[PDB]
Amino acid sequence: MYKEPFGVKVDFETGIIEGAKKSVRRLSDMEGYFVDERAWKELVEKEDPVVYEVYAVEQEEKEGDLNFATTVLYPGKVGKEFFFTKGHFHAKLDRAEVYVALKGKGGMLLQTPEGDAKWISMEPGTVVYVPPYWAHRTVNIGDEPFIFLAIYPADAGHDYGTIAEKGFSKIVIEENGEVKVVDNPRW
Amino acid sequence: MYKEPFGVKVDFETGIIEGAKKSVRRLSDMEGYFVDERAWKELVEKEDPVVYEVYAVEQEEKEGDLNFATTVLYPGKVGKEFFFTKGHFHAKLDRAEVYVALKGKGGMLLQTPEGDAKWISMEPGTVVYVPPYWAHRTVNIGDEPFIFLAIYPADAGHDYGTIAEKGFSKIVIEENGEVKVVDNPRW
Ligand SMILES: O=C(O)[C@H](O)[C@@H](O)[C@H](O)[C@H](O)COP(=O)(O)O
Ligand SMILES: O=C(O)[C@H](O)[C@@H](O)[C@H](O)[C@H](O)COP(=O)(O)O
Numbered sequence: 001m002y003k004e005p006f007g008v009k010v011d012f013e014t015g016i017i018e019g020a021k022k023s024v025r026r027l028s029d030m031e032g033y034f035v036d037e038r039a040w041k042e043l044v045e046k047e048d049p050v051v052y053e054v055y056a057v058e059q060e061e062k063e064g065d066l067n068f069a070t071t072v073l074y075p076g077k078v079g080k081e082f083f084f085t086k087g088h089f090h091a092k093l094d095r096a097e098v099y100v101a102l103k104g105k106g107g108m109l110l111q112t113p114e115g116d117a118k119w120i121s122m123e124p125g126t127v128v129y130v131p132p133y134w135a136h137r138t139v140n141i142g143d144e145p146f147i148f149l150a151i152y153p154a155d156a157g158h159d160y161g162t163i164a165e166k167g168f169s170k171i172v173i174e175e176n177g178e179v180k181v182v183d184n185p186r187w
Numbered sequence: 188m189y190k191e192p193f194g195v196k197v198d199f200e201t202g203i204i205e206g207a208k209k210s211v212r213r214l215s216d217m218e219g220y221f222v223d224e225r226a227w228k229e230l231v232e233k234e235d236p237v238v239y240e241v242y243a244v245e246q247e248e249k250e251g252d253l254n255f256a257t258t259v260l261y262p263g264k265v266g267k268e269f270f271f272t273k274g275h276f277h278a279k280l281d282r283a284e285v286y287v288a289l290k291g292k293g294g295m296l297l298q299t300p301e302g303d304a305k306w307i308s309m310e311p312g313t314v315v316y317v318p319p320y321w322a323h324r325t326v327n328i329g330d331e332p333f334i335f336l337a338i339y340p341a342d343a344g345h346d347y348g349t350i351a352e353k354g355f356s357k358i359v360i361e362e363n364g365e366v367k368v369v370d371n372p373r374w
């Protein structure tokens with residue numbers, strides 16, 4: 001039997017989606033993700049901020065179908081490192097994604113299985129094409145929430161493990177007032 | 188060789204994507220689509236207006252990859268029928284699509300292979316899930332351009348013929364200043 005087409009309202013100012021399933025990630029949920037573990041433990045013990053929220057409208061994992069989700073990535077730093085999403089590869093590696101930036105100042109860090117990295121800056125209106133095989137993480141390099149919408153194949157799934165252990169070959173930090181993308185010393 | 192990730196700017200006020208492949212549909216390119224063949228004929232002679240333009244960023248037709256396109260669907264009527272896109276099923280029938288309304292007032296007309304129909308209103312921020320098996324046409328029911336962004340599987344393709352011959356089982360008209368969705372008499 002056919003599934004019912006539907007329309008949902010997405011508020012471009014808040015990233016909120018009608019009828020979506022919410023996921024909240026606090027700093028506590030990201031142990032082993034940031035370089036400055038001391039700054040991380042400090043911030044978690046102190047206030048444990050929400051780093052991001054995701055509003056997902058997902059389908060059964062089936063070829064050819066599509067999921068979509070907004071993420072509201074909060075502004076902040078862990079030491080010199082800007083707040084970011086955990087990042088993942090797809091489970092079905094060759095699945096692509098399209099992102100549409102809606103609000104705030106940010107960027108995406110991408111890397112291949114071999115760890116070659118790319119950085120793509122994002123401001124409202126930027127659409128980013130995440131090709132097959134690239135892991136991706138977004139980073140909020142500004143003072144307000146960075147909000148985007150992602151559309152991904154329903155069967156892409158998420159591989160978080162490889163990134164959780166090694167991280168990305170690069171990191172995004174504030175150095176002398178400027179945003180810089182530099183080698184990750186942990187890598 | 189992995190493909191290069193990239194970002195492109197989409198202008199939410201004009202629907203233009205910087206450097207995208209541009210397509211123009213004038214009314215003469217849509218013979219056999221509107222119920223009122225005489226009004227079609229006359230509007231073509233008098234003016235042949237652009238019905239819509241599409242800005243597409245497409246990938247090769249591989250499974251799991253994704254394309255995205257904006258459409259600027261211009262305001263107008265053919266007889267009593269509102270301007271609309273030709274409409275299509277996908278070549279690979281079970282491919283879904285996600286549309287994001289950016290500007291204007293419009294809506295989407297959808298139908299199954301058996302001709303069962305559904306109408307979904309679209310205002311800015313409305314996200315529509317076009318499920319597998321559903322043919323889809325967008326309609327401009329306002330007096331300004333209706334602009335939206337669609338993201339669709341790169342392998343979905345476009346099957347126009349079914350629709351080109353017999354149309355949708357419903358039409359969207361203006362009657363006494365009011366937008367109405369009614370049975371298509373020529374279906
Ligand atoms: O595959 C996806 O669903 C998209 O990448 C996106 O919706 C992403 O999941 C969120 O922005 C959360 O980021 P993380 O999944 O890396 O935690
Ligand atoms: O599958 C697609 O590519 C989307 O449905 C969308 O991008 C659509 O093609 C245009 O809005 C024009 O509509 P038509 O393809 O019916 O002419």
Ligand code: NI
Nearest residue numbers: 088097136152
């Ligand atoms: Ni993803």
Ligand code: NI
Nearest residue numbers: 275284323339
């Ligand atoms: Ni389509």
